[PDB]
Amino acid sequence: STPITGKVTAVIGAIVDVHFEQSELPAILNALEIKTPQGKLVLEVAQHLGENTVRTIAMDGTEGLVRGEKVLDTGGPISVPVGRETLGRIINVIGEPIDERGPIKSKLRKPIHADPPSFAEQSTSAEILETGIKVVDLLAPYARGGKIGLFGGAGVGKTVFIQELINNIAKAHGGFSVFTGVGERTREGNDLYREMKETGVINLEGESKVALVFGQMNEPPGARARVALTGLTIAEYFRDEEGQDVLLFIDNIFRFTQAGSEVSALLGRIPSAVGYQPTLATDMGLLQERITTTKKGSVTSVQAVYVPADDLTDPAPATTFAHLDATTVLSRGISELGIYPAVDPLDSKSRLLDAAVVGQEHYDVASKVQETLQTYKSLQDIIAILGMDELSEQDKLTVERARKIQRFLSQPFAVAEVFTGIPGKLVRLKDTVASFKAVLEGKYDNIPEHAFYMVGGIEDVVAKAEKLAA
Amino acid sequence: QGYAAEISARRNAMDNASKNAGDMINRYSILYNRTRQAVITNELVDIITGASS
Amino acid sequence: EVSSILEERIKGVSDEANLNETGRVLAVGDGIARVFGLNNIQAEELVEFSSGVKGMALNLEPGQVGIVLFGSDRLVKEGELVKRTGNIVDVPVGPGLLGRVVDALGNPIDGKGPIDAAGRSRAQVKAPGILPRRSVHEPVQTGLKAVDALVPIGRGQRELIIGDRQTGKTAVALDTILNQKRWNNGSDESKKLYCVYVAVGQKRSTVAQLVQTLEQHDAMKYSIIVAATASEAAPLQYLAPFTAASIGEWFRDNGKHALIVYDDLSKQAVAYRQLSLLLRRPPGREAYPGDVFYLHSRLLERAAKLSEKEGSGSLTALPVIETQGGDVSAYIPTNVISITDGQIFLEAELFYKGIRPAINVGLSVSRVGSAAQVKALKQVAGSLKLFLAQYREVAAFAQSDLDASTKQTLVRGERLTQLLKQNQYSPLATEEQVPLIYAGVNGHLDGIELSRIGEFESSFLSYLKSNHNELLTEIREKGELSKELLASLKSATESFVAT
Numbered sequence A: 001s002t003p004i005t006g007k008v009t010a011v012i013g014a015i016v017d018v019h020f021e022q023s024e025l026p027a028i029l030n031a032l033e034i035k036t037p038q039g040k041l042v043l044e045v046a047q048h049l050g051e052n053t054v055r056t057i058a059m060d061g062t063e064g065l066v067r068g069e070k071v072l073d074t075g076g077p078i079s080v081p082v083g084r085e086t087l088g089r090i091i092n093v094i095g096e097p098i099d100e101r102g103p104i105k106s107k108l109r110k111p112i113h114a115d116p117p118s119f120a121e122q123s124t125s126a127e128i129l130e131t132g133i134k135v136v137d138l139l140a141p142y143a144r145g146g147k148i149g150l151f152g153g154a155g156v157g158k159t160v161f162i163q164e165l166i167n168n169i170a171k172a173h174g175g176f177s178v179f180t181g182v183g184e185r186t187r188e189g190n191d192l193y194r195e196m197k198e199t200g201v202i203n204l205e206g207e208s209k210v211a212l213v214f215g216q217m218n219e220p221p222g223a224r225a226r227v228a229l230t231g232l233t234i235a236e237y238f239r240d241e242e243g244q245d246v247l248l249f250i251d252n253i254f255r256f257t258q259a260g261s262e263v264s265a266l267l268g269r270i271p272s273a274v275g276y277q278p279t280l281a282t283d284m285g286l287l288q289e290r291i292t293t294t295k296k297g298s299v300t301s302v303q304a305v306y307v308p309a310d311d312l313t314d315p316a317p318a319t320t321f322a323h324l325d326a327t328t329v330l331s332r333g334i335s336e337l338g339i340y341p342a343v344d345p346l347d348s349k350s351r352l353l354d355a356a357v358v359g360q361e362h363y364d365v366a367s368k369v370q371e372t373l374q375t376y377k378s379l380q381d382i383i384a385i386l387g388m389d390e391l392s393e394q395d396k397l398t399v400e401r402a403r404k405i406q407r408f409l410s411q412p413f414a415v416a417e418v419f420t421g422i423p424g425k426l427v428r429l430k431d432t433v434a435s436f437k438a439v440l441e442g443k444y445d446n447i448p449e450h451a452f453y454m455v456g457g458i459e460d461v462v463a464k465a466e467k468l469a470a
Numbered sequence B: 001q002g003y004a005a006e007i008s009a010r011r012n013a014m015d016n017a018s019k020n021a022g023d024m025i026n027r028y029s030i031l032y033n034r035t036r037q038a039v040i041t042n043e044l045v046d047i048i049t050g051a052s053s
Numbered sequence C: 001e002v003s004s005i006l007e008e009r010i011k012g013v014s015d016e017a018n019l020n021e022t023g024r025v026l027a028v029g030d031g032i033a034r035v036f037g038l039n040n041i042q043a044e045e046l047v048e049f050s051s052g053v054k055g056m057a058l059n060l061e062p063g064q065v066g067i068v069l070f071g072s073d074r075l076v077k078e079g080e081l082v083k084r085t086g087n088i089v090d091v092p093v094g095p096g097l098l099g100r101v102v103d104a105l106g107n108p109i110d111g112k113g114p115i116d117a118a119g120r121s122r123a124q125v126k127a128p129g130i131l132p133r134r135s136v137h138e139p140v141q142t143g144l145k146a147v148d149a150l151v152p153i154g155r156g157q158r159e160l161i162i163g164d165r166q167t168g169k170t171a172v173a174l175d176t177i178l179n180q181k182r183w184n185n186g187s188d189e190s191k192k193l194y195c196v197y198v199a200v201g202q203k204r205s206t207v208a209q210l211v212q213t214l215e216q217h218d219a220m221k222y223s224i225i226v227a228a229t230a231s232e233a234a235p236l237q238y239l240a241p242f243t244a245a246s247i248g249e250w251f252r253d254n255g256k257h258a259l260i261v262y263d264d265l266s267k268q269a270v271a272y273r274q275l276s277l278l279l280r281r282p283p284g285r286e287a288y289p290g291d292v293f294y295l296h297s298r299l300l301e302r303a304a305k306l307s308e309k310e311g312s313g314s315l316t317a318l319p320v321i322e323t324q325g326g327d328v329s330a331y332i333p334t335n336v337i338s339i340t341d342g343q344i345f346l347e348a349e350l351f352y353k354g355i356r357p358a359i360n361v362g363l364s365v366s367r368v369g370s371a372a373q374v375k376a377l378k379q380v381a382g383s384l385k386l387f388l389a390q391y392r393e394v395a396a397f398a399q400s401d402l403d404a405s406t407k408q409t410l411v412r413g414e415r416l417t418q419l420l421k422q423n424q425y426s427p428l429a430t431e432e433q434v435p436l437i438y439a440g441v442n443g444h445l446d447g448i449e450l451s452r453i454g455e456f457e458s459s460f461l462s463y464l465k466s467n468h469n470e471l472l473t474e475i476r477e478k479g480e481l482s483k484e485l486l487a488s489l490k491s492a493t494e495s496f497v498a499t
Helices: A132-137 A158-172 A186-198 A223-237 A254-267 A280-289 A315-321 A332-336 A360-385 A391-410 A428-439 A460-470 B002-052 C001-012 C145-150 C171-184 C202-215 C233-254 C267-279 C291-298 C333-340 C348-352 C377-378 C382-393 C404-419 C430-441 C452-466 C467-476 C483-498
Strands: A008-009 A017-018 A031-035 A041-049 A052-060 A070-073 A147-152 A178-184 A211-216 A250-252 A302-307 C021-029 C030-038 C045-049 C054-060 C066-069 C080-086 C090-093 C119-122 C161-164 C197-199 C223-228 C259-263 C320-323
Touching: A017 A070, A017 A332, A052 A223, A052 A254, A132 A360, A132 A428, A147 A158, A147 A315, A158 A186, A158 A250, A158 A302, A178 A186, A178 A223, A178 A254, A178 C452, A186 A211, A211 A223, A223 A250, A223 A254, A223 A280, A254 A280, A254 A302, A254 A315, A280 A315, A280 C233, A280 C267, A280 C291, A302 A315, A360 A428, A360 C348, A391 A428, A391 C233, A428 A460, C021 C066, C021 C080, C030 C080, C045 C066, C054 C233, C066 C233, C090 C233, C119 C233, C145 C382, C145 C430, C161 C171, C161 C333, C161 C348, C171 C197, C171 C202, C171 C259, C171 C320, C197 C202, C197 C233, C197 C267, C202 C223, C233 C259, C233 C267, C233 C291, C259 C267, C259 C320, C267 C291, C267 C320, C291 C333, C320 C333, C377 C430, C382 C404, C382 C430, C404 C430, C404 C452, C430 C452, C430 C467, C430 C483, C452 C467, C452 C483
Parallel strands: A147 A302, A178 A211, A178 A250, A250 A302, C161 C320, C197 C223, C197 C259
Antiparallel strands: A008 A017, A008 A070, A017 A052, A031 A041, A031 A070, A041 A052, A041 C021, C021 C030, C030 C066, C045 C054, C045 C080, C054 C066, C090 C119
16 A cells, blocks of 8 residues: 555544645645545545645545544546546546446546636637527527526526427537536436436437436535536546537536535635635636637537526626626516516527627517517506506507517427427527517517417417417 | 596695605615615624634 | 747756745645745745745735745645745736737737737836826727717726626727727827726636637737636736736836726626635625725726826726626725726616617716817717706606607607617727717707618718718817818708708
């Protein structure tokens, strides 16, 4: 054995400090393993405290550690398995196959901490992903190589949205994907595992076109923090070394922020505003910066974000808010109105919604939608008390058009056939631009309002008009 | 006679409404101001408690 | 070629000499290495570790000198030589920095070879005093019609760009940079504003987009972009505006003009919080570092307008502050609002309502005001301020049986508001700002229906160019509107409106 043997000195909470013997001190961010009857606890060295005492964060349960129990050093940051043999595994924070397909047949391991690609490396891009979801396509399209971000509330139908997105985007995407789950419920986990086994994305006879890194919220406070990192490294291997495009997806990334709050507190750093870690900015930065479209390849993150108590002024959603390219804020109110997807049309902004980028026609149609809806929102107060009994002829037309546009957003989804039962609908990008254009022009202002509820394109609006006619 | 009385009443009524609303603005303004102060203090105490340890 | 350059480089490193002072890290945690040693260390001096990371020594504590690491934690490891660089934080400054994207240290991150610089100047030097400063007196035309008329911006006076989160705040700023191309290109050296944009805490992808956009509008050639990206370590982020100010000083001192746009000071604040709390310096209000008012005030007062004694330089500044949910009572916004000398308040609702730039006319103020504004533009847009004021007040009355007077206001007001929109990422010359605004002011465009206002605008410009580019040239060069010029203009507008 190595003369690198440490004896645990304090099993505190997750913080467990080890007291290595003379000159050999494992460097900050390396990974220590303590052989245990459980298996291997991996502890990440996180401070050096002087006098040959390192202070490490546990990544597995700390119960049963016996003070003074010998600690071996791996010698580098938690080293995952990476490969094309990582497709169709479910690997956990410490990178062990937790799906019991037997040993991951990896050729390489890589560190979980690797510096983001330099300023020189960055390369601008702007290509338009076709979500196939009406609200998304028209009013804030997503872009390939971007950092798409599914910001939304607590239980505002986040799961439904994510499920639809996986169905569309994943199948469409050419490259592999890594679906990485940071701290989401194991009920949700099993559903996702099952769902993509059914959809054949994970084909355990064939070769899966996706990998999984599920760390779930029953895992020790430390592990939740660096589980996100574990996932990043699988994506990096694909992006760089294997040169293919990727489509990393992480869920819910607020949980990454939240996780960081916990291990900050335990490490004993004086808590900052609204209890977030002092390292709040830089921790967001390390995750976000790493995932970007280099000249090597392209990785398009789609990150769910959970807005605690539906207040997006809270420091944790707000910190995340900056980094992501194409925000879509799913709001509770819009959900309550019955509009599914619940994306709030007046709050979704994409930075690649620019007139040149999306084309002049797309731009004009979408600009007109935004103004029409926004006016309606402004008028909402007047309508509430005074009534529509002093709203002008123009205003009455604006209310009517806006109400029609407002409910034109709802579209039944393919995974909402068990949540609804109206067959899912995916409209083309071109079709969405056209269909909304017609509505705005007032070409279908003769159609009754309920025929815009849960329909596809304009053709469907006409079809529902006939249905009502009967 | 009626139409004039009606519109005259509506003017009178909406005028009294504006006054009543003003009073509510002032009352809730004081509540707002206090509430704002309280949040700053309460938050501050939490930070202090942490540092003190 | 490249081989020759490498051969030059190996030759270009020489053997060293005995290096005074050393430390051994006592404990390194949290990016706050605390080193025991460094007997004589100047406060805030740059110290270089064995590993190769650089740090500065913010806390000189009674027995240990607390270096803050400018890179990843992993680099330094407990006990290891900590060399004393011996020069307090300084960054290369010079005329030569024009056109290079440089990081906080000053190293070229654009990869266009070594930064040629004419001095290295310290990054904490104190602001111009009472007698050095002479009051603002030279317009800076940002080229956005709304900024230039509604809220004039003059040389050497900081004015905030405080607005709601990701309402394309940066766009309003970037527009200013583009318009400076018009004056810049020429040969009048008492007209060139050499802008420096300081991107603090923005993702590397965003700053790459910035770089490309500037190159696209052929604007890198009077731009220096100090970029300390989100990835970069919290000390680098901390020193990023301070460093930037020093880059600006070369311009100010040498007597050019320049505008440094600190984007966004809201993130600067967050970085200072991270440093202070991690160094265990006492916490303070809203968990922001105790002296946070003092930090922001130091940065923003380096901007000034030098007296004619001191070479008549300037250093306009434009901090950008991100208002979290528009709560302008928040501690970091409130401090900055006090420090600054003006505000432009971009409102999210307006942005949504299609008014882009989304300057809320009511809640913006210019405190240096009429000192700026081209004399011509001042004359024909005093009215514009007053008209819009009425339109705001009479706005809510737009919900019946309305007086003719009220209706007149509404027609004029709606048309003006529509008129002041400016297509994103394109500036508009001052010589065409004065004509366009003239039309609205004189009420010629009151008759034109709202949908055609936009079409009219472009048409008016082409019409002005064809019919009387003599008129335009006179407006541009004379820069003051004489009654005879206003006469010609009235005629021109009449002719244009008729067609």
